[PDB]
Amino acid sequence: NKTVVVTTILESPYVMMKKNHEMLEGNERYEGYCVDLAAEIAKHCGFKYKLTIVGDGKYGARDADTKIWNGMVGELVYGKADIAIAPLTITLVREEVIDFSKPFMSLGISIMIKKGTPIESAEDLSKQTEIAYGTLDSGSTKEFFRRSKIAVFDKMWTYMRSAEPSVFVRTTAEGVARVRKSKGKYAYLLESTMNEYIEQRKPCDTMKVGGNLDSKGYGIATPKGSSLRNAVNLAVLKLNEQGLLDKLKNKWWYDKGECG
Amino acid sequence: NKTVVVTTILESPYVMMKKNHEMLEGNERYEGYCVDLAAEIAKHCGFKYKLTIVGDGKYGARDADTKIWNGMVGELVYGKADIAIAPLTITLVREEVIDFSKPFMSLGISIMIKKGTPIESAEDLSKQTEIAYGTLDSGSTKEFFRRSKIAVFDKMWTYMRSAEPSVFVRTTAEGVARVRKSKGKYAYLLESTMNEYIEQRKPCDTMKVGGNLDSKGYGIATPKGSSLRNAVNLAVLKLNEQGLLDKLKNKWWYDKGECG
Ligand SMILES: CC(C)S(=O)(=O)NC[C@H](C)c1ccc(-c2ccc(CCNS(C)(=O)=O)cc2)cc1
Ligand SMILES: N[C@@H](CCC(=O)O)C(=O)O
Ligand SMILES: N[C@@H](CCC(=O)O)C(=O)O
Ligand SMILES: [Zn+2]
Ligand SMILES: [Zn+2]
Ligand SMILES: [Zn+2]
C-alpha cells in the first residue's frame, strides 16, 4: 500500500503556493481547488498521496516528430506519476493514451478581452487584424485550433500559426498579462474556467466575451491499467451528487472574488 | 458480426416518431437527437444496430425492496439490450451497475412553469402550497430530491412524497401536459434540456424559471463487460471534438424552435 504520486500544475486557482509554504511540509505547501479536490478524492478512494508539480510546467502534448508526451500527460504515460488532479482537459488524443474520470468541471474555449475591446465573438476575431489573438503554446486550446476540420477555426489557426511576433504564450499568466498590457489589441483564447476566474481578480480589467467555442470538461487522469480508475471515477460522481464540486468552484472562483 | 440492440426512450426531441412513421420500418420510424447520435456512434464503432424503445417506458431505478432495476438501466442489467443511447443521466447508483461513456450533453434539474406562475425558484416553490409540483417517476430527478440534504430540496421532497393527489408523473409528456392544463397550479421539475426544448414549442405557454439545481451529463450506457465500452467512449469524444454534438443540439433544439 503505497503513497500515490499526484501530478498537478501551478495554475490559479487550482494549485497555488501558500503564503507560508517555505515553513510547511509536503502537501501542506499548496492550496487551491485541485488541492482540495485531491484531498477528497484520496479520502473517498482510501489512498495516501503526495502532490507533485509537473516538472516541465506543461499540461500535455505529443511532439509530432519524437512522439514523446510532455507535461502531466507525459508524467502519467511514462510512469512518473500515478494520477493527475489538475485542470486537464479531456481530449480524444489524451483519452487514447490515459484514462479520464467523468469530468469534475465543465469548460469551453472562450475569448478574453481587455474591457472595451470591440470584439463580441470568434467570428469577430477572424474577420479583423488590428487585434492580435493567440492561445497557450502547449495545451488543448492550441490543439483545438490546429486539429479543427471546421472552416472558421481553420481560418483562425492559419492566422495564429503564422503570426509574428508569436501570438502564443507559455503560461496563462503571460496570456492574461499580455491582454492587460496590449491596450485592447490582443485577445486571449483560453478556457472559460480560467477566463471566469480572471474576470473576478483585481484589477478587474478583463472579461469573457461571447459564447464558448466548444463544450468539454476537466477529468482526473490515470495511466491505463491503473487500479485507481474505477474508484476515482465513482468519487467524482459522489462529489458531484453531494454538491461538493459546485461548492469548491464557488469557494475558489467567486466566494473570494475581488471584483464585487 | 451481431446486430447491436439499442435501448432508447420516446422523449422529445431525443427520439420521436416521424410524422409518417406508420409507413416506415425499423430504425427509420424514429427521428431526433439520439436517433442521429446512434447512427453516428454505430458508424464510428463499426456496428449495425436496432433501435428498440424501452418496454416499460422508464429511464431506470432500482426497487428499494427487491433490488430489481427497471427502465433502460434494467434492460442493460438483464441483457435485454446491448447499449442505451438516450438522455440517460449519469448517476452514482447507475454507474455502479452499468458503464457510462463520457457525457455527450450537459443538463441540470430545472423548473417548468405555465407562463405567469408567480414562481422564480425552488425556494419559492418550497415556501408555498397553492402551486403543486412534482417530478418524473423512476428517474434521476426524483432520486435527486429523495437524496438531497439541502434544506430547500428536502422540504420539497418531504412535500412531494406525501402530496395528494400524486404530484409524480409517468412520462415527461404527462408532466408538461399537467403544467399546461393546471392554470398555473402545477410546476414541473425536469431536466433543463427538456425544459428548454419545450419552451421553444407551440403553444409557447411554458418557461424555465430560476437557475439549474445541479450540473451533470447524459452518457451512453453499456452493461458491465461490454466489448463496445471503449469504442463508444472514444466515439463520444470524437463526436464532441468534431463539433457534431453541438450541431445535433442546434438541429434539434433551436432550428426546431416554433416560438420565434
Ligand atoms: C469531452 C466532452 C465529451 S465531456 O465528457 O467533457 N462532455 C461534453 C458535453 C458537452 C458535456 C457534458 C457534460 C459536462 C459536464 C461536466 C462537468 C459536470 C459536473 C459533473 N460532471 S458529470 C458528473 O460527469 O456529469 C457536469 C457536466 C461537460 C460537457
Ligand atoms: N486545460 C488545458 C490547458 C489550458 C489551455 O489549453 O487553454 C489542457 O489540458 O491542455
Ligand atoms: N434523464 C433522467 C430522466 C428525466 C428526469 O428524471 O427528469 C434519467 O436518466 O433518469
Ligand atoms: Zn514561494
Ligand atoms: Zn468527502
Ligand atoms: Zn461522424
XYZ file of C-alpha atoms and ligand atoms in Angstrom:
572
model
C 0.000 0.000 0.000
C 1.958 2.950 -1.402
C 1.731 6.727 -1.436
C 0.037 7.751 -4.691
C 2.055 10.323 -6.671
C -0.268 13.100 -7.867
C 0.928 15.314 -10.670
C -0.620 18.766 -10.889
C 0.215 22.187 -12.224
C 0.695 25.641 -10.712
C -2.331 27.325 -12.224
C -4.512 29.663 -10.207
C -6.822 28.925 -8.516
C -6.368 25.167 -8.950
C -2.968 24.888 -7.263
C -1.102 27.794 -5.692
C 1.782 28.123 -3.306
C 0.605 29.021 0.171
C 1.995 32.322 1.540
C 3.986 30.480 4.185
C 4.906 27.404 2.102
C 8.615 27.510 2.961
C 7.609 26.803 6.575
C 5.312 23.940 5.556
C 5.894 20.311 4.501
C 4.652 18.153 1.645
C 1.016 18.573 0.619
C 0.516 21.418 3.069
C 2.688 23.676 0.870
C -0.165 24.075 -1.635
C -3.709 25.369 -1.743
C -6.481 25.702 -4.294
C -9.381 23.941 -5.944
C -7.310 20.920 -7.034
C -5.581 20.691 -3.674
C -8.999 20.450 -2.014
C -10.211 18.075 -4.684
C -7.152 15.805 -4.335
C -7.719 15.540 -0.579
C -11.307 14.469 -1.187
C -10.502 12.033 -3.991
C -7.830 10.471 -1.816
C -10.196 10.216 1.167
C -13.034 8.628 -0.826
C -10.722 6.180 -2.595
C -8.775 5.401 0.596
C -5.249 6.298 -0.514
C -2.379 8.365 0.848
C -0.874 10.709 -1.728
C 1.878 13.153 -2.493
C 1.204 16.262 -4.582
C 3.977 16.924 -7.100
C 4.206 19.883 -9.520
C 4.699 18.746 -13.129
C 8.411 19.127 -13.927
C 8.098 20.994 -17.224
C 5.079 23.125 -16.183
C 3.003 21.845 -19.092
C -0.370 20.232 -19.487
C 0.430 17.618 -22.067
C 1.042 17.484 -25.770
C 2.684 14.915 -28.031
C 5.563 16.155 -30.204
C 4.832 15.443 -33.909
C 8.394 14.205 -34.591
C 9.568 12.387 -31.423
C 6.077 11.105 -30.421
C 7.033 11.999 -26.822
C 4.380 13.284 -24.415
C 5.313 16.264 -22.265
C 3.530 17.806 -19.258
C 1.263 15.977 -16.895
C 0.109 13.535 -19.560
C 3.799 12.631 -20.082
C 4.236 12.066 -16.355
C 1.337 9.579 -16.419
C 2.364 7.920 -19.697
C 5.987 7.381 -18.582
C 5.004 6.303 -15.046
C 6.438 9.338 -13.225
C 3.041 9.938 -11.605
C 0.072 7.788 -10.629
C -2.731 10.314 -11.127
C -3.219 13.814 -12.426
C -5.569 16.037 -10.480
C -5.445 19.321 -12.392
C -7.348 21.449 -14.934
C -6.521 18.823 -17.537
C -8.879 18.829 -20.446
C -10.453 15.582 -21.582
C -9.396 15.167 -25.207
C -9.507 12.275 -27.642
C -5.707 12.215 -28.240
C -5.218 12.081 -24.491
C -8.075 9.570 -23.810
C -6.342 7.311 -26.322
C -3.245 7.121 -24.033
C -4.628 7.788 -20.483
C -7.950 7.268 -18.756
C -10.064 10.150 -17.570
C -12.727 10.145 -14.923
C -16.099 11.705 -15.655
C -15.463 15.477 -15.829
C -15.312 17.287 -12.498
C -15.656 20.734 -14.034
C -17.133 21.983 -17.279
C -15.462 24.473 -19.617
C -15.178 25.618 -23.140
C -12.687 27.638 -25.092
C -13.546 31.292 -24.662
C -12.305 34.756 -25.536
C -10.662 37.049 -23.022
C -10.593 40.732 -23.875
C -9.377 43.861 -22.181
C -12.648 45.641 -21.258
C -13.783 47.850 -24.154
C -12.185 45.786 -26.934
C -14.621 45.847 -29.897
C -14.932 42.019 -30.135
C -18.106 40.015 -29.426
C -17.259 36.576 -30.944
C -14.734 34.174 -32.550
C -16.239 35.309 -35.881
C -15.392 38.920 -34.963
C -11.746 37.940 -34.308
C -11.355 36.033 -37.580
C -12.765 38.967 -39.650
C -10.290 41.613 -38.366
C -6.497 42.084 -37.988
C -5.972 45.064 -35.613
C -6.467 42.905 -32.522
C -3.985 40.024 -32.325
C -5.199 36.703 -30.854
C -3.481 33.565 -29.519
C -3.520 30.612 -27.115
C -1.370 28.746 -24.566
C 1.592 27.348 -26.509
C 1.165 23.664 -25.455
C -2.399 22.712 -24.488
C -5.808 21.600 -25.642
C -6.824 25.117 -26.741
C -3.967 25.277 -29.212
C -4.788 21.724 -30.404
C -8.445 22.592 -30.925
C -7.436 25.186 -33.499
C -4.674 23.095 -35.083
C -6.769 19.894 -35.490
C -10.010 21.609 -36.490
C -11.952 20.490 -39.587
C -14.266 23.481 -39.137
C -13.843 26.390 -41.570
C -13.777 29.414 -39.168
C -11.419 27.698 -36.668
C -9.190 26.568 -39.536
C -9.138 30.274 -40.547
C -8.112 31.387 -37.038
C -5.420 28.710 -36.825
C -3.985 29.785 -40.181
C -3.572 33.320 -38.789
C -2.204 32.226 -35.428
C 0.398 29.774 -36.728
C 1.970 32.396 -38.986
C 1.510 35.475 -36.770
C 4.638 37.470 -35.902
C 5.681 38.146 -33.239
C 4.336 34.835 -31.860
C 0.737 35.114 -30.586
C 1.316 32.063 -28.355
C 2.134 32.287 -24.671
C 3.988 29.936 -22.300
C 1.608 30.362 -19.320
C -1.935 31.586 -18.640
C -0.404 34.370 -16.550
C 1.528 35.516 -19.654
C -1.631 35.464 -21.788
C -3.523 37.497 -19.140
C -0.660 39.986 -18.682
C -0.496 40.333 -22.496
C -4.206 41.183 -22.635
C -3.776 43.721 -19.797
C -0.732 45.382 -21.445
C -1.798 45.422 -25.136
C -4.319 48.298 -24.780
C -7.156 46.278 -26.371
C -5.032 44.987 -29.302
C -4.575 41.390 -28.044
C -7.356 38.892 -27.268
C -6.537 35.629 -25.488
C -8.189 32.290 -26.217
C -8.350 30.225 -23.089
C -10.690 28.021 -21.163
C -13.867 29.600 -19.765
C -12.912 28.491 -16.259
C -9.692 30.459 -16.302
C -11.411 33.370 -18.105
C -14.173 33.430 -15.389
C -11.542 33.309 -12.674
C -9.529 36.200 -14.031
C -12.652 38.349 -14.581
C -13.115 38.241 -10.758
C -9.476 39.219 -9.966
C -8.021 42.715 -9.450
C -7.669 44.913 -11.314
C -10.931 43.699 -12.941
C -9.898 44.907 -16.417
C -10.625 41.737 -18.402
C -13.805 39.909 -19.314
C -15.139 36.845 -21.078
C -16.932 37.872 -24.315
C -19.251 35.781 -26.482
C -20.202 32.130 -26.313
C -17.786 29.263 -25.783
C -16.299 27.668 -28.897
C -16.731 24.143 -27.554
C -18.019 22.281 -24.511
C -15.875 19.876 -22.574
C -14.545 19.161 -19.132
C -11.551 18.529 -16.965
C -11.086 14.982 -15.795
C -8.902 13.230 -13.302
C -6.385 11.234 -15.332
C -4.791 7.899 -14.577
C -2.373 5.721 -16.599
C -4.067 2.850 -18.474
C -4.436 -0.215 -16.213
C -4.480 1.890 -13.031
C -6.081 0.201 -10.026
C -7.368 3.717 -9.098
C -9.505 4.174 -12.224
C -12.948 2.924 -11.042
C -12.704 4.366 -7.548
C -11.592 7.774 -8.838
C -14.483 7.859 -11.256
C -17.108 6.946 -8.627
C -15.548 9.506 -6.261
C -16.054 12.236 -8.844
C -19.666 11.176 -9.287
C -20.267 11.077 -5.499
C -18.707 14.502 -5.046
C -20.811 15.995 -7.791
C -24.009 14.495 -6.358
C -23.157 15.722 -2.863
C -22.705 19.229 -4.255
C -19.007 19.423 -3.379
C -17.766 20.244 -6.871
C -20.103 23.264 -7.053
C -19.060 24.307 -3.539
C -15.375 24.074 -4.395
C -15.818 26.059 -7.567
C -17.655 28.777 -5.657
C -15.002 28.716 -2.933
C -12.093 29.332 -5.326
C -13.762 31.489 -8.008
C -16.478 33.629 -6.517
C -16.588 33.443 -2.689
C -13.248 35.325 -2.516
C -13.899 37.274 -5.790
C -12.214 40.714 -5.796
C -14.497 42.374 -8.396
C -17.732 42.782 -6.363
C -20.993 -9.763 -36.550
C -24.028 -9.242 -34.255
C -26.687 -6.519 -34.579
C -26.465 -4.270 -31.526
C -29.750 -3.853 -29.648
C -30.018 -0.143 -28.694
C -32.456 0.657 -25.906
C -33.821 4.175 -26.007
C -36.881 6.141 -24.852
C -39.534 8.124 -26.671
C -38.650 11.550 -25.361
C -38.687 14.752 -27.411
C -36.508 15.790 -29.109
C -34.229 12.784 -28.446
C -36.368 10.038 -30.033
C -39.662 10.840 -31.668
C -41.966 9.063 -34.119
C -41.693 10.590 -37.565
C -44.969 12.087 -38.807
C -45.281 9.338 -41.413
C -43.889 6.551 -39.154
C -46.829 4.184 -39.882
C -45.467 3.698 -43.422
C -41.861 3.303 -42.192
C -39.910 0.336 -40.868
C -37.332 -0.424 -38.183
C -34.891 2.393 -37.379
C -36.466 4.648 -39.998
C -39.585 5.086 -37.845
C -37.709 7.389 -35.484
C -36.053 10.767 -35.619
C -34.328 13.010 -33.108
C -31.069 13.843 -31.420
C -30.445 10.318 -30.096
C -31.507 8.772 -33.395
C -28.783 10.878 -35.061
C -26.397 10.083 -32.235
C -26.981 6.313 -32.527
C -26.294 6.483 -36.250
C -23.033 8.347 -35.649
C -21.855 6.112 -32.806
C -22.625 2.977 -34.794
C -20.686 4.454 -37.742
C -17.603 5.330 -35.683
C -17.671 1.961 -33.871
C -18.483 -0.146 -36.953
C -21.675 -1.843 -35.779
C -25.165 -2.443 -37.160
C -27.979 -1.703 -34.714
C -31.681 -1.930 -33.992
C -33.345 0.911 -32.082
C -35.757 -0.525 -29.571
C -37.910 1.568 -27.343
C -37.651 0.599 -23.683
C -40.565 -1.730 -22.850
C -41.632 -0.123 -19.590
C -41.094 3.436 -20.858
C -38.765 4.290 -17.964
C -35.256 5.601 -17.501
C -34.265 3.318 -14.693
C -34.366 2.982 -10.966
C -33.750 0.212 -8.503
C -36.635 -1.010 -6.357
C -35.526 -0.476 -2.743
C -37.024 -3.808 -1.619
C -36.409 -6.239 -4.483
C -33.223 -4.540 -5.803
C -34.550 -5.003 -9.367
C -33.691 -2.303 -11.902
C -36.368 -1.133 -14.310
C -36.228 1.042 -17.410
C -33.324 1.312 -19.803
C -30.948 0.573 -16.947
C -32.801 -2.701 -16.283
C -32.658 -3.594 -19.961
C -28.864 -3.297 -19.876
C -28.520 -5.027 -16.480
C -30.604 -8.067 -17.544
C -29.028 -8.366 -21.041
C -32.177 -7.299 -22.918
C -30.240 -4.539 -24.682
C -26.591 -4.069 -25.584
C -26.405 -0.302 -25.254
C -28.576 2.661 -24.185
C -28.445 5.751 -26.339
C -30.836 8.152 -24.665
C -30.999 11.207 -22.351
C -29.864 8.899 -19.549
C -28.375 10.780 -16.632
C -25.021 9.661 -15.332
C -25.559 8.883 -11.667
C -23.604 7.149 -8.998
C -26.127 4.376 -8.332
C -26.318 3.635 -12.059
C -22.566 3.849 -12.658
C -22.261 1.120 -10.033
C -24.186 -1.408 -12.267
C -23.613 -0.112 -15.835
C -20.864 1.836 -17.559
C -21.326 5.302 -18.961
C -19.372 6.967 -21.702
C -18.139 10.495 -21.195
C -21.232 12.767 -21.172
C -22.500 13.765 -24.617
C -24.712 16.562 -23.257
C -24.882 18.679 -20.144
C -28.011 19.437 -18.157
C -29.289 20.325 -14.721
C -32.576 19.926 -12.893
C -34.841 22.895 -13.569
C -38.325 24.264 -13.013
C -41.003 24.493 -15.670
C -43.964 26.783 -15.043
C -47.033 27.794 -17.030
C -46.305 31.354 -18.166
C -47.190 33.863 -15.446
C -46.957 31.454 -12.497
C -45.525 33.547 -9.624
C -42.568 31.213 -9.019
C -38.944 32.188 -9.677
C -37.004 29.497 -7.812
C -37.027 26.169 -5.957
C -37.055 28.244 -2.747
C -40.293 29.920 -3.947
C -41.907 26.505 -4.545
C -40.817 25.198 -1.102
C -42.328 28.223 0.717
C -45.946 27.740 -0.509
C -48.718 25.160 -1.080
C -51.084 26.692 -3.690
C -48.872 25.627 -6.617
C -48.297 21.853 -6.630
C -45.065 20.471 -8.075
C -43.556 17.108 -8.896
C -41.102 15.110 -10.953
C -40.846 12.114 -13.245
C -41.117 8.636 -11.662
C -38.155 6.182 -11.989
C -35.712 8.869 -12.984
C -32.735 10.779 -11.729
C -34.664 13.924 -10.840
C -36.833 12.066 -8.352
C -33.723 10.460 -6.851
C -32.047 13.859 -6.537
C -34.892 15.053 -4.318
C -35.088 11.761 -2.419
C -31.385 12.010 -1.523
C -30.961 15.741 -1.034
C -29.811 17.074 2.287
C -30.233 20.676 1.062
C -32.996 22.207 3.235
C -34.928 23.717 0.264
C -34.860 20.399 -1.628
C -35.522 18.177 1.416
C -38.519 20.408 2.269
C -39.628 19.925 -1.330
C -39.113 16.157 -1.178
C -40.952 15.922 2.173
C -43.898 17.624 0.457
C -43.792 15.749 -2.895
C -43.504 12.257 -1.407
C -46.682 12.830 0.651
C -48.637 15.189 -1.696
C -52.249 14.250 -2.553
C -53.190 13.867 -5.288
C -49.857 12.458 -6.515
C -47.507 15.092 -7.956
C -45.403 12.455 -9.758
C -45.847 11.560 -13.419
C -45.104 8.531 -15.636
C -43.631 10.468 -18.555
C -42.215 13.880 -19.301
C -45.121 14.455 -21.701
C -47.520 13.873 -18.746
C -45.602 16.407 -16.602
C -45.666 19.017 -19.393
C -49.350 18.387 -20.200
C -50.067 18.731 -16.467
C -48.319 22.141 -16.328
C -50.222 23.333 -19.412
C -53.658 22.274 -18.150
C -53.439 23.271 -14.471
C -53.759 27.091 -14.971
C -50.506 27.821 -13.068
C -51.303 25.481 -10.152
C -48.694 22.863 -11.113
C -44.979 23.320 -11.723
C -42.789 20.548 -13.027
C -39.236 19.633 -12.095
C -37.378 18.308 -15.104
C -34.041 18.485 -16.821
C -33.020 21.790 -18.385
C -32.576 20.161 -21.815
C -36.193 19.045 -21.929
C -37.438 22.263 -20.323
C -35.596 24.406 -22.897
C -36.871 22.283 -25.764
C -40.485 22.603 -24.612
C -40.123 26.360 -24.057
C -39.483 26.677 -27.806
C -42.538 24.581 -28.858
C -46.122 25.734 -29.547
C -48.215 26.733 -27.722
C -45.226 28.560 -26.101
C -47.044 28.666 -22.751
C -44.309 27.294 -20.527
C -40.980 28.547 -19.394
C -37.922 27.622 -17.443
C -37.510 29.711 -14.277
C -34.508 30.033 -11.972
C -31.066 28.523 -12.093
C -30.393 24.852 -12.549
C -30.398 22.928 -9.292
C -27.412 20.802 -10.300
C -24.975 20.213 -13.149
C -24.477 16.830 -14.767
C -24.493 14.928 -18.062
C -26.160 12.301 -20.161
C -23.994 9.326 -21.037
C -24.211 6.404 -23.445
C -24.580 3.317 -21.233
C -23.316 -0.224 -21.728
C -23.621 -3.309 -19.488
C -20.517 -4.121 -17.498
C -18.088 -6.195 -19.542
C -19.315 -4.830 -22.898
C -16.888 -5.007 -25.850
C -18.436 -1.697 -27.013
C -17.423 0.312 -23.934
C -14.099 1.802 -25.056
C -15.058 2.394 -28.698
C -18.315 4.092 -27.664
C -16.456 6.267 -25.191
C -13.911 7.376 -27.796
C -16.679 7.842 -30.338
C -18.426 10.317 -27.994
C -15.181 12.264 -27.617
C -14.523 12.241 -31.394
C -18.080 13.437 -31.996
C -17.700 16.234 -29.499
C -14.334 17.298 -30.879
C -15.726 17.381 -34.438
C -18.489 19.755 -33.273
C -21.085 17.129 -34.218
C -22.684 17.044 -30.788
C -23.085 20.856 -30.917
C -24.510 20.585 -34.463
C -27.050 17.987 -33.301
C -28.092 20.118 -30.330
C -28.664 23.140 -32.624
C -30.509 20.891 -35.124
C -32.983 19.571 -32.560
C -33.432 22.500 -30.132
C -33.018 25.872 -31.775
C -33.544 25.197 -35.504
C -36.746 23.370 -34.422
C -37.984 26.431 -32.440
C -41.610 27.480 -33.024
C -41.744 30.396 -30.575
C -39.803 32.986 -32.637
C -15.127 15.994 -23.667
C -16.636 16.034 -23.603
C -17.233 14.938 -24.445
S -17.134 15.876 -21.901
O -17.042 14.497 -21.466
O -16.430 16.896 -21.145
N -18.778 16.306 -22.130
C -19.126 17.068 -23.352
C -20.523 17.613 -23.140
C -20.696 18.919 -23.872
C -20.516 17.829 -21.682
C -21.435 17.219 -20.870
C -21.378 17.421 -19.516
C -20.420 18.240 -18.973
C -20.346 18.377 -17.561
C -19.112 18.487 -16.971
C -18.990 18.538 -15.605
C -20.123 18.463 -14.836
C -20.014 18.477 -13.368
C -20.103 16.985 -13.077
N -19.833 16.267 -14.355
S -20.587 14.752 -14.669
C -20.710 14.194 -13.003
O -19.666 13.885 -15.381
O -21.943 14.955 -15.139
C -21.358 18.359 -15.417
C -21.473 18.320 -16.782
C -19.499 18.847 -19.786
C -19.550 18.640 -21.140
N -6.689 22.688 -19.730
C -5.787 22.767 -20.889
C -4.718 23.855 -20.720
C -5.224 25.265 -20.966
C -5.496 25.569 -22.423
O -5.018 24.847 -23.340
O -6.132 26.604 -22.655
C -5.133 21.440 -21.233
O -5.449 20.440 -20.562
O -4.303 21.354 -22.168
N -32.609 11.869 -17.591
C -33.337 11.305 -16.448
C -34.847 11.283 -16.727
C -35.520 12.645 -16.612
C -35.696 13.142 -15.185
O -35.553 12.364 -14.218
O -36.034 14.348 -15.037
C -32.849 9.924 -16.118
O -31.896 9.442 -16.727
O -33.377 9.311 -15.184
Zn 7.259 30.897 -2.753
Zn -15.761 13.755 1.089
Zn -19.121 11.014 -37.653
